[PDB]
């Protein structure tokens, strides 16, 4: 199945924001990060990926698709705007394993407190 998250300059939890910034998938799903608004990119954060995973990078305004395959919690952040709390946690399949590793990754503190919030959303 695909699924699409938009990359904003506005949206309903604030400024520079991944919408929706939580979304829960099936391995082999796909999802499409979308340049609604332009400057951003999505990227893999360190320590915020599970094992069978690979990092991914995409460039500025790039419509960007990537299939999630290894069952976990991925967080992914907006370079530009990574200190401004850009960022997203895609969970991929159910009782994710690598809740712990990814809680305790260091983010900037915006970040951070978006990351929390998603991963409450998502019943972390
Ligand atoms: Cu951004």
Do not use: W
Request: charged share 25%; hydrophobic share 40%; aromatic share 8%.
């Amino acid at each position: 199945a695909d699924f699409e998250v938009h990359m904003l300059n506005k949206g309903k939890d604030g400024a520079y924001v991944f919408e929706p910034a939580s979304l829960k998938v099936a391995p082999g799903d796909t999802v499409t990060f979308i340049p609604t608004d332009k400057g951003h990119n999505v990227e893999t954060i360190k320590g915020m990926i599970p094992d069978g995973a690979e990092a991914f990078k995409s460039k500025i305004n790039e419509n960007y698709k990537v299939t999630f395959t290894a069952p976990g919690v991925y967080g992914v952040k907006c370079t530009p705007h990574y200190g401004m709390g850009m960022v997203g946690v895609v969970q991929v399949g159910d009782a994710p394993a690598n809740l712990e590793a990814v809680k305790g990754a260091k983010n900037p503190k915006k970040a951070q407190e978006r990351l929390d919030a998603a991963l409450a959303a998502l019943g972390n």
